[PDB]
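INPUT
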Amino acid sequence: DAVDCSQNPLAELKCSVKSFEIDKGIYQTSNFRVVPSGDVVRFPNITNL
Amino acid sequence: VSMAKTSVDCNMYICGDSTECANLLLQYGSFCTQLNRALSGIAAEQDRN
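OUTPUT
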């Protein structure tokens, strides 16, 4: 048998606890974050020329 | 009969958005995982208490 650890939330837990069978309950399997979008770059107005 | 149910994001703490750091953290194995279990265990007791 085999588990694709990226398929779904269930897969993550199974891989995380290293088991093909889970008894019951609530489990934290990973952290998460939101990915930033575009870039914002800012430089000074007037310089010497 | 209780204390704060604290939690720590290991990766966030060690590696402030650094890919190189993360690679240099993974080389240490289950370090983050072990810490997570310990903190979770405490919070669980805080509920029972």
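end of record. The interface with chain B takes residues 28, 31 of chain A (CB under 8 Å).
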